[PDB]
């Protein structure tokens, strides 16, 4: 169940309300200000990292279940989502529908959105690819 949720469900959830659009209307006060601006933020693919922990000083390093148990740390990994930021503007003429046009401002990056706890012995856990010898090295019971 957990493997299905991480691999597929996470992307599906983000691809429902990925689009948030704010419209700034013409605000007719003078003829020199008659443009209507549209700001768009969209969410694309999501990336999940391996389990990790960030210390107080800000150093981030790979975390293993053995260390997490002793240090009272949560065995979790970070989630990154590609964000497409677009803005459209159009000339608002009274009594007519607008024709929004791209204003040559389309930012192309990964944004941290939180940490997802990782179930042990899952596809995203360090122990899935560990053999019996590897588990003994990592102080984990086979």
């Amino acid at each position: 169940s957990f493997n299905q949720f991480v691999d597929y469900t996470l992307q599906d959830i983000i691809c429902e309300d990925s689009t948030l659009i704010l419209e700034q209307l013409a605000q007719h006060t003078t003829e020199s200000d008659n443009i209507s601006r549209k700001y768009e933020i969209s969410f694309g693919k999501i990336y999940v990292t391996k389990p990790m922990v960030n210390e107080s000083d800000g150093v981030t390093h790979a975390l293993y279940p053995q260390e997490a148990r002793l240090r009272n740390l949560t065995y979790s990994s970070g989630l990154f989502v590609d964000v497409k930021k677009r803005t459209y503007e159009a000339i608002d003429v009274p009594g007519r529908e607008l024709k929004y046009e791209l204003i040559a401002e389309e930012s192309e990056g990964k944004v941290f959105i939180g940490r997802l706890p990782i179930m042990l012995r899952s596809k995203n856990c360090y122990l899935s690819e560990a053999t019996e010898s590897d588990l003994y090295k990592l102080k984990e019971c086979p």
């Binding site: 948030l20 659009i21 704010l22 419209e23 700034q24 209307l25 605000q27």
Partner: peptide
């Protein structure tokens, strides 16, 4: 005047 800020679905 309008609210000068609205959300379009």
């Amino acid at each position: 005047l309008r609210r000068k800020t609205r959300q379009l679905k």
